[PDB]
RNA sequence: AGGGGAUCGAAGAUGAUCAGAUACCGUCGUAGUCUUAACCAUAAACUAUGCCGACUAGGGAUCGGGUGGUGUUUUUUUAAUGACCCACUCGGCACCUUACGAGAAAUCAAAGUCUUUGGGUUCUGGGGGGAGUAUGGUCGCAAGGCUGAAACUUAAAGGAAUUG
């Protein structure tokens, strides 16, 4: 049948979009597809905040952050747990948890 | 069988039929 | 020795309500069946179809029986009942119960000039229940009922005499064909007519009139 | 057709205005456009307290002159309405379904909560929409204290008050009890007020 | 573990519903009452009935239950409902601008203030 | 709507469309093309006299298991060698 | 078992067990 | 573009009667629309209509009164003789005692009963019941 | 409808919705009949004499039943200013 | 054909893996991927929903334009302007609730106004295969495209949804 009213993910008035490449397998997947997450992490993660604070010069200067825009294909996101299979009524909800 | 490779198999058969027609006039 | 549960049952046991006519006029919810057991004597049945149905379980194959039945007296009242039960005698019995719960009337009419106790339907009507349209056309006197045997028996139990029935869709499904004919009978009463264009002083709610005998004991 | 004493009675108008019934919601809805008077700035719509008053009087005409007064039913699940519907039950006939409705209460003749009313009042249609649906199954008229942004489906004569105000809900239930009593005939001398008083109908926290 | 079943809960709720005045707050007395006012056929079951009856009676004397209701409970719940407070004047009515426009459009005395 | 033309002078288009769709139909195409005369083993006839060339025993199709024991005959008026099933029991022994 | 004529099968068994309780009644009347 | 203004008018009337409205607004207008609605009004199927006359084609508001089950147009206007009127009324009237087939006749726009009485036939236009 | 002698047939005339003038079906279990009280001097609604309205299931389903009863109450004088003809 | 040739990379070279692996995995690598002038005319070219027109149900966002506001913030003393807010309107891509209706159902504000069958018009389909095959024509450097059967064979193939 037709599983989704958006045919998988939203295009709605283009016809064609430029594709990106998945970050785990480098599959060419369109930009309206290809689940996009923002990795906001620290270089000085919490197992070493006190270590670098006690071993750093320039006392209390800052702590830098790493920012990544990760495009996952459908197979890689399902395998790596970014996305989950849903029930029929729960597929209609599009609110972040 | 997959229809794509069925199309390819009939394509080879068409080429060989044309070749044997040209061979035997 | 039946006992009423509802206000309508209390009124009909008191015998103050004397007809399904004020029942259908005030569109009262039929919740029990003894009301028209007492009110519609000689309401004969006909079982139309007994059909097995199978649900696939873990290891077995659970087979229930589906009974579709009709009821009618001789003139202008039909009920259609569907029941699914493990025993087919119980299916027939409870289908009779459901058909009595679902008795509805018909608009009989004339094909031409009005002479002697209407024979056919009023208007050309239709009913659709799941890709089966059953269309009922009035017919001249003495032409009989032309239909498949099941629809013919339903209309014979209705008491019409002269119908042309057309039918489209998969008519081999007896349940949908009977349901389509049932909806066609309903729409036959539901149509509006220049005879019905006049205005009536609007009825007076016998439950409201007789609420003191309709109260709790 | 109504006599002159069925008007606003300004002495009851300050009850309405002080209970803050005149305010509505931020959404209008097409079946409640006639009830809306004006749009106050900062996104509030005001409800015509006059129009609420004659709709209340008409609903009193519906609720009164039911020949057996007990068959009227009062449905409540909002936490701001149980005490009000219990007091209305005490004063009038008014069998109460304060609390859970038990879906299958008007149909399903083998339930213990099997009531077959002749008139429903609902404290709030959106939060009690099961009872309105069941009345639609089994041929019962419905009175509702609707809002501007209320579901108008399957509902008869409605009185738009607030459904967001504790005081609004309680005082409208109180007023309806007042007028059904004064039309059925416990209270005479219509110019005189009522001994029972609205903060009795207002609920407590517990 | 020690979860009581539908048999003991159903019987205990019916007995407590229709026999509230004669029941007591002690297990020994209550189980003799169950012996007399119930034709129960099992001794251990009888003890279980009486134990859940006693626990539910403790909760009844502490407060109301959402499972069942009584005639004495009905009298006390009415009286606690018609507890009546004093009236909710501060001179004139409160601040009003366009609902004051509403009241002057309809026409009434209504001494009110502005916003 | 409905795709078909509805105007009062559209009967030419209606006739042309009907002729093409009739060519799509099965029985009409067989009749007009005359496969009864061009390609049928009979000459469009109900019956035909032939003479037996051989007696062939052919196995049934699944799930049935039997030998049907037909004959191979040659038609006199055409020459087309066809295969004819012999009817009820022992008539194979009757036919030589 | 025959799924498609169970209606007649059960009605025939209905007549049969009604008959069997009838001879039970007849035997009771003969003994008494 | 608009090919049959009567078809648009009758579609609007039919849709709003199914919706249960008491009145319709019809744009644009015609002599044939006015005369068809006049036959409707004379047989009582509709109530009263007002013709709003701007200097364009104009509009109509029709106050209905119920009792109009379905009104339909037959496109194209078919050349019906005096012997095919019975075929047409049997094809698309619900019963032989009510309903009218409206003909565009050289004597005027009228129903098939007045056509039978005046003994004159024409182009079939529509039908009401 | 009648016969040749004017003897009544049609065992029951149907009720008509007072909003859309449509036939109220026997199976229409949403269609409600409302009996409004007849008020004489200071209430005292005389028992047995009610102003009656009938609403059909279609009107209730589309949800314009409130608007229809505002209109009908104003037509029969039950209310004075609740429904404006020009929105 | 000419130029350009970094990356990736059909064919291929190898190293794995495997019972086999001229498959998936790893290293390189031809044509190609880029471009100028000519071709080809096919895609799950999909919204699997012809185009034009009218009507039928509510809502909230958004893009572009326009109207109204003794509205907000900005210059240097608060006007213009720009941006933002509110109300409305036209035209878009859509979205949410319901089912008035429609559907075999999934679902649909169109897939509605369809047995109460007719707004205008074009194309396509007639059980599954054989088969987009054979042949004939036409276009093409070819690759192939458009047009396009029959003999023969078969009682199913298939759509939606339910239970295991
Ligand atoms: Zn991937």
Author numbering:
A (entry chain Sa): 2 to 98
B (entry chain Ln): 1 to 25
C (entry chain SC): 34 to 250
D (entry chain SA): 2 to 207
E (entry chain SR): 2 to 89, 96 to 122
F (entry chain SX): 2 to 97
G (entry chain CS): 111 to 142
H (entry chain SW): 2 to 130
Passage from the reporting paper:
Tigecycline is widely used for treating complicated bacterial infections for which there are no effective drugs. It inhibits bacterial protein translation by blocking the ribosomal A-site. However, even though it is also cytotoxic for human cells, the molecular mechanism of its inhibition remains unclear. Here, we present cryo-EM structures of tigecycline-bound human mitochondrial 55S, 39S, cytoplasmic 80S and yeast cytoplasmic 80S ribosomes.
Unlike the reported structures, we selected the dataset derived from the tigecycline-stalled monosome sample. We obtained two different high-resolution yeast 80S ribosome structures, one state with eEF2/Stm1/eIF5A binding and the other state with Not5 and P-site tRNA binding. We found four tigecycline binding sites housing a total of six tigecycline molecules on the yeast 80S ribosome. Contrary, we do not observe E-site tRNA in our yeast 80S ribosome. Therefore, we cannot confirm the conservation of these two sites. The existence of these “secondary” binding sites most possibly being a result of incubation with high concentrations of tigecycline (100 µM), however, our observations reveal conserved binding sites between human and yeast.
